[PDB]
Design a protein around this nucleic acid. Structure first.
Lengths: 58, 74, 129, 166, 240, 70
RNA sequence: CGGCCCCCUGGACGAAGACUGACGCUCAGGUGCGAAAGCGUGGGGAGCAAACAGGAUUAGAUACCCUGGUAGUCCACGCCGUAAACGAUGUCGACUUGGAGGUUGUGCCCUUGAGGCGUGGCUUCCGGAGCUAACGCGUUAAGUCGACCGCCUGGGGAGUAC
């Protein structure tokens, strides 16, 4: 919910996901994966990106 | 004691045998097998001069039938 | 074979310093002595010697500051076929005077500052960088 | 910071930013590449090529390599008396001693770069490759040997280095 | 002291070998061959060895942390012995690349090691399966061996104690960007070039390399001892 | 190239290695191809080339020890 | 540049004693001169082979592969010397840490080691100072230089046109 709002409001999102991952590992837990989709930056293709850090079993 | 200059086994581990003489058959046979041919220099670790004059000498000798030229004559 | 002998002096000074050599020797000449004196005092060489009753011969000691080379190049500018002559008013400025031009005036070999100060011109021999 | 010139707070001169991928064996590279030059107007050797997973990190990594293990280089604002004839990887620059009273002319982004680099008045026109990455190397490779002496004894200065060399 | 000449001659009469290969930039401290064996020149070594030890003492008074780096099969006991105790650090199950530049990571992996050693011996991870515990028991052994003689090290070291350069060139390079003074012991194929103080030697003969290092190690370690007793006196004066 | 040299104690299998010393090589090896005069000088002469592997091998024994692979 | 030899003859490598004393360097034009095959006439010609047939392949022996098979290959003399003419790097010369191999003149050595040391020789491995886009070079440079020459200035079309 917090990440989706940034995109909703057409804010630049240059660091936003990277700081999502950082604040979550700063507040607790042992690992996070974030994957973001919805045409990043306004591209006219599908364009995803992702970041996983610590231990996330699958 | 000083100045021996070639007693034995000194300068080199293998002797240079003849240079350019071709009238003795046994001096030549030091580098010719019974199969009837000259040995590569790589295999003996001979030095190149004594081998170069011998190539000439062994052929002078071959052409006079002092040696077999070819394996079919064993 | 020998077509420029102040170029050969120079390359010996250059290479002397690149191989950490203490001294560098070559045949001597009048131009080579008059330069070696201006070079001693402005410390672009450390000292020199002259020897030979039969033929003269030149011994030189290299420039250092800390122990490894500090002079980038020493190259000659007026040479066999492109001899370059300058007037009193147009004597050059070499690295705001941290470097030298060695300058043959009619009054002899000196630096470009004493050559200017007399108000002579002449052949501008060799530069540092 | 440390062995660095009297900069105060950092110069954040970003010249370029890019994103590169082979996409050959497991999808594209998500990483970005960054070019930044960091000076202080008085002379520094700071130049940083960096890369990271995302653009904020690429620039910040590139700036970090531009401010650590840099010597201070002690030229007088825009005047310099002893440059080097710059070559860096086929990209060639040719500075000489000069007034600051004349100003500096340079096209593209280079009149903004030369000023934070402190070498702007001494510069004269480039030749060879016109790659952004190696054309700005004037204050790095062009100062690898230098001085800017203010003493009246400047020609007995090298004499002074010689009798310390004895 | 004169003692620095006694160790150097007693060790150095090995003359090396290293077949006939060697390196031209070492040439001055190399005496000419006696039939395709190389011979070290000791007579050129006596100014060298005396230069090197005198500089060791002055950093003795400055340091908390020593790194002995460059280890090899023939050098392992001498590197273990050179440290003697836990104010002096050494790697003997190998140095690894970036052990100083990424010291952040080392202090994390030491914190993993000491955590699994107290868990393992208490019994804390031994639950679930025996496989899951055993692959851990083995990685803890592997940390225990790799780190055992450096595990306590509270910080970046003051100096670098190099016993061979041939295989450990990265460790030298990175200590130089960290701005650390290097004290080097070189063989015939290594260069004297580009490092601050040299002992000319050779890498063969296990009898020389045990002694060179022992002389170097005694110097710094006993230097610290006599400086340390002075340091105490100097500070208790302040409060009186 | 069963080789004329007689094997110690005669047998139906020739001890072809122990018989040969420099035979077939150069003489009966270049079968059914166009014979050149001077090509050996640049084609064959790789003695310099093999001398490098022999030095390298004598260097690496000391170096595996210095790495502690040994 | 290669059967072996002789007839004619170059150039280089060492080494001492002596001699002359810048008689030097580079070089448009230039005369002389060919790896290989082209090529005219005389002497000669076993095998292989462009071409040419036919097989085999994939539709071209003339893509790929084989077999026959002709000019050719071979010599004497005679005609313009082409290319990948080079460690793809002109010349000659001065200067810049060297070790070791192959192998040779030669002082010294169980010439005990195609070795060592003493000093030249080509030739080759190795890497420093320096140089390079990169490989790579490095005392046989692609280093520091010196003088003078050759030669290049986007590609195709053109090594032809003119």
């Amino acid at each position: 919910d917090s990440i989706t709002s940034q995109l909703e409001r057409r804010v630049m999102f240059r660091r936003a996901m990277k700081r999502a991952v950082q604040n979550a590992m700063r507040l607790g837990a042992k690992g996070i994966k974030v994957e973001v989709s919805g045409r990043l930056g306004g591209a006219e293709i599908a364009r995803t990106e992702w970041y996983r850090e610590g231990r996330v079993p699958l | 004691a000083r100045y021996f200059r070639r007693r034995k086994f000194c300068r080199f581990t293998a002797e240079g045998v003849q240079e350019i003489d071709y009238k003795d058959i046994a001096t030549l046979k030091n580098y010719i097998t019974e199969s009837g041919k000259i040995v590569p220099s790589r295999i003996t670790g001979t030095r190149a001069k004594y081998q170069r004059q011998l190539a000439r000498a062994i052929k002078r000798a071959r052409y006079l039938s002092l040696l077999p030229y070819t394996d079919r004559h064993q | 074979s020998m077509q420029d002998p102040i170029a050969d002096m120079l390359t010996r000074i250059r290479n002397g310093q690149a191989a950490n050599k203490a001294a560098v020797t070559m045949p001597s000449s009048k131009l080579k002595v008059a330069i070696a004196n201006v070079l001693k005092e402005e410390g672009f060489i450390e000292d020199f010697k002259v020897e030979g009753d039969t033929k003269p011969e030149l011994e030189l000691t290299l420039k250092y500051f800390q122990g490894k080379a500090v002079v980038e190049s020493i190259q000659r500018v007026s040479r066999p076929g492109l001899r370059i002559y300058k007037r009193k008013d147009e004597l050059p400025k070499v690295m705001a005077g941290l470097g030298i031009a060695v300058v043959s005036t009619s009054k002899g070999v000196m630096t470009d500052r004493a050559a200017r100060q007399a108000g002579l011109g002449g052949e501008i021999i060799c530069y540092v960088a | 910071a440390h062995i660095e010139k009297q900069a105060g707070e950092l110069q954040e001169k970003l010249i370029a930013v890019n994103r590169v991928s082979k996409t050959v064996k497991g999808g594209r590279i998500f990483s970005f590449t960054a070019l930044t030059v960091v000076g202080d107007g008085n002379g520094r050797v700071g130049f940083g090529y960096g890369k990271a997973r995302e653009v904020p990190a690429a620039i910040q990594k590139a700036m970090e390599k531009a401010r650590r293990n840099m010597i201070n280089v002690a030229l007088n604002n825009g005047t310099l008396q002893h440059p080097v004839k710059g070559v860096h990887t086929g990209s060639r620059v040719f500075m000489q001693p000069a007034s600051e009273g004349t100003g500096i002319i340079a096209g593209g982004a280079m009149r903004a770069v030369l000023e934070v680099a402190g070498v702007h008045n001494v510069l004269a026109k480039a030749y060879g490759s016109t790659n952004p990455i190696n054309v700005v190397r004037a204050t790095i490779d062009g100062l690898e040997n230098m001085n800017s002496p203010e003493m009246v004894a400047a020609k007995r200065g090298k004499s002074v280095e010689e009798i310390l060399g004895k | 002291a004169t003692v620095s000449m006694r160790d150097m001659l007693k060790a150095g009469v090995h003359f090396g070998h290293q077949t006939r290969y060697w390196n031209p930039k070492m040439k001055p401290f190399i005496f000419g061959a006696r039939n395709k064996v190389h011979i070290i020149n000791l007579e050129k070594t006596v100014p060298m060895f005396n230069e090197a030890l005198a500089e060791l003492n002055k950093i003795a008074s400055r340091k908390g942390k020593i790194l002995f780096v460059g280890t090899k099969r023939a050098a392992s006991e001498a590197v273990k012995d050179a440290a003697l105790s836990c104010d002096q650090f050494f790697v003997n199950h190998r140095w690894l690349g970036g052990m100083l530049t990424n010291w952040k990571t080392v202090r994390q992996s030491i914190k993993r090691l000491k955590d699994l050693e107290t868990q393992s011996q208490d019994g804390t991870f031994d639950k679930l399966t025996k496989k899951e515990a055993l692959m851990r028991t083995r990685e803890l052994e592997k940390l225990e061996n790799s780190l055992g003689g450096i595990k306590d090290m509270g910080g970046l070291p003051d100096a670098l104690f190099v016993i061979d350069a041939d295989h450990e060139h990265i460790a030298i390079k990175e200590a130089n960007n960290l701005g650390i003074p290097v004290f080097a012991i070189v063989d015939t194929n290594s260069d004297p070039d580009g490092v601050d103080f040299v002992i000319p030697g050779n890498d063969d003969a296990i009898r020389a390399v045990t002694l060179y290092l022992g002389a170097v190690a005694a110097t710094v370690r006993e230097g610290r001892s006599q400086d340390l007793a002075s340091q105490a006196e100097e500070s208790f004066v302040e409060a009186e | 190239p069963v080789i004329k040299v007689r094997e110690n104690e005669p047998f139906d299998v020739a001890l072809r290695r122990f018989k040969r010393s420099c035979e077939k090589a150069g003489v009966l090896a270049e079968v059914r191809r166009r014979e050149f005069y001077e090509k050996p000088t640049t084609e064959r002469k790789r003695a310099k080339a093999s001398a490098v592997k022999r030095h390298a091998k004598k260097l690496a024994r000391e170096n595996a020890r210095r790495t502690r692979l040994y």
